[PDB]
Amino acid sequence: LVCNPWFEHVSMLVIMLNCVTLGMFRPCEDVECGSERCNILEAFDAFIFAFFAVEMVIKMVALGLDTWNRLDFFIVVAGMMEYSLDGHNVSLSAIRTVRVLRPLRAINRVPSMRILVTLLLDTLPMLGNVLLLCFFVFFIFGIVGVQLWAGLLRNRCFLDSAFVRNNNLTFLRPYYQTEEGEENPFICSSRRDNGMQKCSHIPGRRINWNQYYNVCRSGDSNPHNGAINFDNIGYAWIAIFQVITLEGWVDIMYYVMDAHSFYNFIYFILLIIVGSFFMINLCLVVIATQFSETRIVDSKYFSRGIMMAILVNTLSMGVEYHEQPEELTNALEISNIVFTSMFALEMLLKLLACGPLGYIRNPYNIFDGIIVVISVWEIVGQSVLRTFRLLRVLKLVRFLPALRRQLVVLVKTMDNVATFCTLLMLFIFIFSILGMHLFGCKFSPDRKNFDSLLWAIVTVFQILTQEDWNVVLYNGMASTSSWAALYFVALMTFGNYVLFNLLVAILVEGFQARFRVSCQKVITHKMFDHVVLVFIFLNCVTIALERPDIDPGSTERVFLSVSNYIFTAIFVAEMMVKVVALGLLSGEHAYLQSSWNLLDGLLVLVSLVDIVVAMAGAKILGVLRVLRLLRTLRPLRVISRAPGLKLVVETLISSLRPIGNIVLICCAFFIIFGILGVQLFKGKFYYCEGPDTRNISTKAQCRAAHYRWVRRKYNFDNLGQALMSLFVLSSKDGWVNIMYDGLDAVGVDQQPVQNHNPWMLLYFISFLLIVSFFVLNMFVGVVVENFHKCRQHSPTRRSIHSLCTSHYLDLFITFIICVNVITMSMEHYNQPKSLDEALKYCNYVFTIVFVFEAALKLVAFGFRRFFKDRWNQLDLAIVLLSLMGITLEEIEMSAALPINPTIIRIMRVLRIARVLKLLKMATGMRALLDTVVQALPQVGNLGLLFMLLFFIYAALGVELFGRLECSEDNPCEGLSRHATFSNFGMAFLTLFRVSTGDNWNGIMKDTLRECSREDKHCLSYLPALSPVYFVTFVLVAQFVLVNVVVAVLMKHLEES
């Protein structure tokens, strides 16, 4: 019975059968239970429970009263409750949700999965230190947010009560709401605040009703059907968690910038650094560390000739585009006819030399033979085989030993990744059917729905890639309850911050296992570099003051122009003195013998050319524009003057060498999938734009209805457009909307139809999985190489003294603060007056208790001894600080009111410093933080290079996208009043959003759209420079952040 191993196979067979039974559930066709298909299924479910209820009885009898056995018991008891409770209509369907745990039974049956899970479960206990840091981040930022912005997102511009009453009119809506309704609320700034958006910024009517919306008072709903708000700690954590995932964090920021103050970007800039970057990556570091702790034919010319033939044929395949001329199509087919014949000629020649048996011996020779038959088949069969022509690129593996070796390493990586992938599909499947039960037919139908297994699996994969996962959250919260946020918190936590970081650990562990003399003296002078470095810094200020809105006749413009001449002359002399002392190139130690000196040569050379063009009253405007762009690279001279920056830059360029092959393989997949996308999707990315297009089906009907026939910004018309779209897909920002366009594509001059071809999910989901795999071997490649580099390198006082030294006092304080932590989370918007008094009294008790602690501490140790320890100093600061906060509160109560209310609010917010006491107790957390501190010298310079990169691009963006405008005639999708390149200050903030990758594809869209005919000073080739601007910044920015993570990882490993 139980001894025989085949019994387990029988149990496994039933398990797989139970999984398919769950996957056939239809959310809102089986709830009625009136169909015959449901009737057979429920019987089929009942039969399966009988087996498992039977089996558990046999096993219990055989073995009597193993964690997995306990889980199996829990499923039986829970389902028995569901089964036995039948006949009671009170929450019968709700009890039906526990059956989603049945597939977990498969973990124990598969030995490989059981081992991996067991290893995973033994790594969790050491993640508590990271969890405590998560509590500090959420709790500190969760109360500061509530204290500042509690109830400020309800604000709306209302009509005056006297106005409506006296004039006896009630046709107007009570408060301004744009015609989209509550989906895009207009949040105003209260009179006592200084938010950016005021009720006087309301656009006029388009005699005027809008001008009478001139009262900003609290409304009756928060943004997104109440989902986004800070009215209490519960709703503040939903907002903070969404910011940590870097999805829609700007939208939350803009809401409080419009209502409270522009300087709220400080709150979100710190959160994205402390929480989104360091906290969410310290999880990766801890897991990875802990896992490690647990005759003519053979001629060279012939091979080169064949290699060239394949390469040229591949290039030809990528020259197709929409509206292709007929002659070009004919030429390509003739080219295909020739190339396949050439391979056929090679196919025959090799057969003769080695014979039929000899040719079969070579494995690559077998693959080539498979290609010739299909190539000839296509001609003789004269379109599905056309898509198979892309396989010819695989022939190049024969002649690339470096890539051939690399591909072998990646292929062998699948043996270790196979077990994990099986664990990810089970994880997704359980959450897919769980979602169906909760959000079944409740999303009234949105494309991101849980109405069926196919579209429930896709919506769970989309959430885990963090693309519009908040849009689903709002629908989930509104439909069922605000507590539905727990579904997304668990799905995003166990999936991205546990399972994904386990995959990286699997890979890492697998791999791991006379005048000239004067010049010579002046340049060699110690302070020469620092003197020059000061001039460069002053030159950065001049660059950062440039902006489009500078009036040419103003004094600022002349000042900027004059300084440019001064700095140009200064740096010419500095270059001139160096060359005289060292010589241009003739000498061995000549000036141009080092790249850094060469870099300064070009920067000086372009400056001289700029002067000449400026000297020239001629048609040279185009040249002046290019020069203005290259004059933003001047800050690059800082690297050679700072030894710390020079070393790190040379280190990053070194890290690119080990992963060079993977990059080349990654760039080869972009072209392969880019060419494939063009063939499938060229010319099909057009749609009819208008208020109502349910009738439109073709281009002509769109013109007849006086609507506009437009094209998607990200399409696959040609390999140029296909590569730009694939990069956006790979970045996982806006990747869903490109998928929707592919599914809806119908044909040339045809209106797309929703979910026309669901089979295209394979093209897009496959790309996002393959690319994520490569970009995971780049991170591992950097880590492994770094590890290689690192290895090679009085009686009344005595009782008081006993108490203070005793741990009793410390643990008592930890209890009081934990109570204070609870009390501080009691506050919410519009709390009852009784609560205000109760919380005020609770503050009194804490104040005196802390005061006694300081008094006892002073007596036990003495004034000089007590002040020595830094912890005691921290106590004194808060106790002194706490007294100041309470003192002002009582004066505010008192008749005198000289205290500005901002002071009282700031004091209340700053009283959260009491939580810092607990940091003393958490020895484990402190040691984790010490790891980052030990890594600061390496991470400090990488932060300097991050800011230098920001400065160059922030100043460059202003030059490029400075004059782009947003208007109802030319609407913008990513830019707004908050995200603009108008000046250096705003371009700096916009680039921070781009680095986080929040709707950065929307910003690029706004630069690709054609300018208005009437508008002037519009750069004709801007759509060509924009993709280069955003691609290079995204890749350069992400490479630096990866190295910061590797730097901390190494310090952790070498400390344990």
Ligand SMILES: CCCCCCCCCCCCCCC(=O)OC[C@H](COP(=O)(O)OCCN)OC(=O)CCCCCCCCCCCCCC
């Ligand atoms: C340490 C934190 C780390 C994880 C944080 C991740 C995000 C957690 C979000 C989960 C909680 C979701 C509930 C949010 C909430 O407050 O709303 C519930 C309720 C409103 O929903 P009704 O459908 O009842 O609407 C009633 C309309 N009149 O809000 C309330 O009115 C009070 C709910 C309790 C307040 C929150 C206290 C507990 C803390 C949050 C719970 C999650 C803990 C996360 C570990």
Ligand SMILES: CC(C)CCC[C@@H](C)[C@H]1CC[C@H]2[C@@H]3CC=C4C[C@@H](OC(=O)CCC(=O)O)CC[C@]4(C)[C@H]3CC[C@]12C
């Ligand atoms: C460690 C902490 C998180 C646990 C203990 C804190 C709770 C006891 C606090 C946190 C937030 C408080 C809530 C914040 C807001 C509200 C809504 C308020 O008004 C409503 O019920 C209307 C809600 C709506 O309209 O959305 C009633 C009190 C209540 C439930 C508060 C009751 C006390 C709560 C649950």
Ligand SMILES: CC(C)CCC[C@@H](C)[C@H]1CC[C@H]2[C@@H]3CC=C4C[C@@H](OC(=O)CCC(=O)O)CC[C@]4(C)[C@H]3CC[C@]12C
């Ligand atoms: C990268 C390797 C593997 C293959 C080489 C790719 C090229 C064949 C691609 C890259 C850029 C592509 C071009 C990008 C843009 C255009 C413009 C497009 O429209 C026009 O010619 C504009 C006409 C006008 O403006 O009046 C026609 C296709 C073409 C030439 C594309 C043809 C195919 C090109 C040359």
Ligand SMILES: CC(C)CCC[C@@H](C)[C@H]1CC[C@H]2[C@@H]3CC=C4C[C@@H](OC(=O)CCC(=O)O)CC[C@]4(C)[C@H]3CC[C@]12C
């Ligand atoms: C180390 C480097 C980066 C130098 C330090 C940065 C400064 C040069 C930046 C940061 C803040 C910037 C300022 C932020 C805000 C404004 C207002 C803004 O004014 C307008 O565009 C006009 C407004 C109006 O007319 O109402 C743009 C210029 C200015 C002074 C910016 C000029 C450049 C400043 C001083």
Ligand SMILES: CC(C)CCC[C@@H](C)[C@H]1CC[C@H]2[C@@H]3CC=C4C[C@@H](OC(=O)CCC(=O)O)CC[C@]4(C)[C@H]3CC[C@]12C
């Ligand atoms: C291989 C992976 C890592 C991506 C690398 C970056 C690409 C996404 C970039 C590099 C060059 C870019 C192309 C450079 C120039 C053009 C021409 C541009 O068309 C025009 O010039 C029309 C505007 C005009 O009239 O000036 C359309 C975008 C495109 C194909 C760009 C698309 C995005 C490209 C392929």
Ligand SMILES: CC1(C)C[C@@H](CN2CCC(F)(CNC(=O)c3cc(Cl)cc(Cl)c3)CC2)CCO1
């Ligand atoms: C390795 C890197 C370059 C990426 C960084 C990972 N980092 C945090 C988790 C994150 F990947 C979210 N996870 C997904 O998006 C995801 C995507 C796929 Cl295809 C499947 C699934 Cl299950 C999840 C976002 C970025 C970690 C250190 O640096």
Ligand SMILES: [Ca+2]
């Ligand atoms: Ca996004």
